[PDB]
Design a protein around this ligand. Structure first.
Ligand SMILES: *[C@@H]1O[C@H](CO)[C@@H](O)[C@H](O)[C@H]1NC(C)=O
Ligand SMILES: *[C@@H]1O[C@H](CO)[C@@H](O)[C@H](O)[C@H]1NC(C)=O
Ligand SMILES: *[C@@H]1O[C@H](CO)[C@@H](O)[C@H](O)[C@H]1NC(C)=O
Lengths: 449, 449, 449
């Protein structure tokens, strides 16, 4: 609906609210096929320029078939990997089934009359299937009567051009698989055109709002999808496309922005600093909160966010209390500490946080008026209403011009509650209570002494 | 001019000097256009092979137009992002203006007679514009007289081939935008050929030395540029190219190399280590120093460095004192500590730093003579004069064969000034004074006790 | 042979054994050539459609030549770089030799009669050379008799099509070099087709098992290779391909998986945690152990691993004792500590580690039976026998279905040996003995007190 934002002066952080998230929980697996011609070289003494062109294109066809066959003798073990495991295990499992005898023929028979099909494999999985290119028919009908005789017939020039056009897609598909070891992401238009992807979506056994969501964000769907080279067997080239399944829809999401909060004493080396940890995207999910620490996990389109759950953490919903009261006793809010008071800015959804320290020149400007605000040392914020850019030292930042409402939540910088002499100043992954217990230990060594 | 280098034995670091930096401060925004034909299908009963080829290519043209139109219904909200904000906000702001009524026609009128133009938008921005492909004229003149009648005329075979060539660039442009959600970087030769880029540079209202700088480093310019898909309206396909504006030129730059400095006691677990932080590129800029911590921010061509200011920090010029005296009282030099005395090497501009610990075999070699130096435990350095490679354990490193002069600055390893029993040995982001104050606190707990 | 795996309950880690490693120690350098035609424009008044097509393709040829020439005036100084130095120094050194007078002609003469050659340069390096495209002969024989007269001859339509096909590869090669500043990796099929790569391998002066290894893993060879644009001189386009040389073969390798080990007290903020550091691939190498911390350094195909030594560390073989006894006195096993008891899983080679803390729902499932195991708080493990997935909170993980045998090594979680009140709970890069000495210091402040 409406994007809103809150800046917390006390902790030098901001939350952008109002987003609606779709979270990828599963995969749709589809088998894409190219029908091939099983032909060997039938060289006949031909020297005319058009037979030579047809022969040269037929060699590129053949080398594409054999290159794919060589690629397959080394199964997709270099596909993907992580502690998160295989993103392609769903597709890989369909490939395994496809190497079973009679399975390829089962797709042959469904595609004997139509372009799209549904096939129930012998493992219980009912996959959609699609033939996107028919080379077997083209080659068997227009080119074998040319080359498979004693002396070659002469094709017309339009057959030469037409065959280069049709074969082109096989060769590009083969080029993409060859440099990516048989797994590509995003899925190119060569693997699946927009028209084929949209038809695939439209033909799936899913609700209408799931069809409409994926159809209106096809480029995000492409970027979250995989194409896995499966098998070349019995005149069939088959590869599996994994499209994202969003098992969480329209869930409330927010983004946390953080920036270093330091004291502003004039003598360098006398200053302590703190920064809230775990910036990034948060989404309500199934009674908990899903947190996405890696910036690439979530794609944003205006009001809507699309996130992959594979590299997310599941947190209690009380994690949000760190944005109402960082000292709350229900969740141990996390911070890191340092004495590195370097100046910086963070562009948020509706404004900009500025951490200005030392001698840095920090300002906010408008295109037509120039400088309209000069920041003082400390952590501060400006909204995108009437501000176009922010400058911190020698770096210029553009503020997002998205519509929405910002709220400045005044409050004492919490760094001012700490005594600089007993402050644990080099904590890389700490927490409010962890810092307070280290301070309790440092007052105790002086209490008895 | 002359690249020179200094190795500081006392802190296991080196500085390479003599570079001349250009720092990207802004953007040139240019509107690139393709003139389209607004035609719907005019199917006529044609079965001849040449009409079929023309129809098939015209469908690929149409699907490219509609794919771009679908891509645009989801505005560039997944373009780029960071705490640094939008790198494309300048281009995005031009796109917004372009969606305003009459603006497209204003580019139409400037390009009514010539290929390049200058257009002042209704927001005060005077952009250069360029038409790189004219499909409207080609289609309206050579192909509508073919297909837009009752029965189709037959084109000659050269028209089939010529149209495939002209349409190819539209389709590739469309392919690139489709997998990148409407924003690409580097800018491909499909978006802008070298000839069009060089002409664009040459035609800009900028000084001659700025023209010559960008023209002599076009591949660096390409890699620092963006192409943003704007609009398809009124037979015009328009996208905006952002080229880097170097607002700092020929500024002195240097690169800091660092390596772990450890004691060399024979019993493992008894050794302490220190490493200088903030390796990377430094450039004088506007009375301060711009520091680039991320390795990809700066491209180097021989003597010259090209850096983006977006992910840089602005430091006081006294930061350089950490290379003359790391204990100086004007700047709090930063270090990290540990007990991980693993061996490694760092290839610098003119040589190699070697940190050799434990039982590691560390040597430097020449191609023709083999091993010419054997390192002992500690941190040491060799220049590229007469050395081709360095080996540390099982890893071989090639030294850069660039011309220049190295200087070995002798000095006591500062790790030897510290008492291993009160040394803070696991500081991730500390500083000379921060370590000294932690040591003062650790001598105080024993002073009274 | 057989992949096996051991899970160490005491330290929440697992080792996957049985892999056979090939480690890249060096480079094969090969010179790839394209023979060019040194022709300037010989415009003659021609307006026929076929001369126009030939002229237009000849301009694309010419602009490709000049674009490559402009790219070369800026030598490969933006190729690659790191503290590890140039991965391409071997190739770059061949380019330098190639700019020497008479060297190009020396490759001309070897390729005067055959397609492949061996040439000894004046620096003692005997490189294999290959001509992959002959444009000089095609242009001088089929196209100069067309355009280089007073009025242009008319080519047949097959010459137009044939020349577009032959020139295409020059233009794509030029496109790839243009956006990558003259250095590409992986090496595309445009740079080197599978047939040319396999022939290059087969023709090298290396043993038969090295030929067979690289020929059976060509896509891994491609991904570990470089293509470096060298020179355009005297009708020769030359670029150098660097293929990996595996100087270590069939060496035993293993992979270390780690996960956080925390106490499981019910009150949040009262829990301490530890995690073993230095997860990743380890390989026996030359009496030491090569360790690869970066996930992309090693490619895995079933039973076999292929690693680059450039970003590896060399460790004593006693590093493996951290997998038999983490308290052993021969090697100081490394750990990091924290109070962040967030739940997670790690998919291993043959199973899954699960660290379940707080209120997280953690389970393992089978496709046909659903949930078959529910984890309790702590660190635990399940093998891939009869398990398909694992769920931790809202994230689902797929287990690898590779064949092999897992072993569960029971043992007391070592985190239970530590007193939570004197535990150093925020150590980013520590070690068993380092933690024990910090605890000794914390018992001493209370011993006297
Ligand atoms: C430190 O001691 C005070 C005094 O009892 C107590 O209120 C506070 O909660 C303690 N903090 C920690 C982290 O133990
Ligand atoms: C530690 O104490 C000595 C003695 O007064 C002083 O010279 C030094 O500057 C102190 N260091 C810090 C970091 O406070
Ligand atoms: C701590 O002290 C005990 C008692 O002497 C000793 O056994 C142990 O090795 C010490 N640990 C360290 C790391 O010094």
């Amino acid at each position: 609906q409406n994007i809103t934002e809150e800046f917390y002066q006390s902790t030098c952080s901001a939350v952008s609210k109002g987003y609606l998230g779709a979270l990828r929980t599963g995969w749709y697996t589809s088998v894409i096929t190219i029908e091939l011609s099983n032909i060997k070289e039938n060289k006949c003494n031909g020297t005319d320029a058009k037979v030579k062109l047809i022969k040269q294109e037929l060699d590129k066809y053949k080398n594409a078939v054999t290159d794919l066959q060589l690629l397959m003798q080394s199964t997709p073990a270099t596909g993907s990997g992580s502690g998160s495991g295989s993103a392609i295990a769903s597709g890989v499992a369909v490939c395994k089934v496809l190497h079973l005898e009679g399975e390829v023929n089962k797709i042959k028979s469904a595609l004997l009359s139509t372009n799209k099909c549904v096939v129930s494999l012998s493992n219980g999985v009912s996959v959609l299937c699609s033939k996107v290119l028919d080379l077997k028919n083209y080659i068997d009908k227009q080119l074998l009567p040319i080359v498979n005789k004693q002396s070659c017939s002469i094709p017309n020039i339009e057959t030469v051009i037409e065959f280069q056009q049709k074969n082109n897609r096989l060769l590009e598909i083969t080029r993409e698989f060859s440099v990516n070891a048989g797994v590509t992401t995003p899925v190119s238009t060569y693997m699946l055109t927009n028209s084929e992807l949209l038809s695939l979506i439209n033909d799936m056994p899913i609700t209408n709002d799931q069809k409409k969501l994926m159809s209106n964000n096809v480029q995000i769907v492409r970027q979250q999808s995989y194409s896995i080279m499966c098998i070349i067997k019995e005149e069939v080239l088959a590869y599996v496309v994994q499209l994202p399944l969003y098992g969480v829809i329209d869930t409330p999401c927010w983004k946390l922005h953080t920036s270093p909060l330091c004291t502003t004493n004039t003598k360098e080396g006398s200053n302590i600093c703190l920064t809230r940890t775990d910036r990034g995207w948060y989404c309500d999910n199934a009674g908990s909160v899903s947190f996405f620490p890696q910036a690439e996990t979530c794609k944003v389109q205006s009001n809507r966010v699309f996130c992959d759950t594979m590299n997310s953490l599941t947190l209690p919903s009380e994690v949000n209390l760190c944005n109402v009261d960082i000292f709350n006793p229900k969740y141990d809010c996390k911070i890191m500490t340092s004495k590195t008071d370097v100046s910086s800015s963070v562009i948020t959804s509706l404004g900009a946080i500025v951490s200005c320290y030392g001698k840095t020149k920090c300002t906010a400007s408008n295109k037509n008026r120039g400088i309209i605000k000069t920041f003082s040392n400390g952590c501060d914020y400006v909204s995108n209403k009437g501000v176009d850019t922010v400058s911190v030292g020698n770096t210029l930042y553009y503020v997002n011009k998205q519509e929405g409402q910002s709220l400045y939540v005044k409050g004492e910088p919490i760094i001012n509650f700490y005594d600089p002499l007993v402050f644990p100043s080099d904590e890389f992954d700490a927490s409010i209570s962890q810092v307070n217990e280290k301070i309790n230990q440092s007052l105790a060594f002086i209490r008895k002494s």
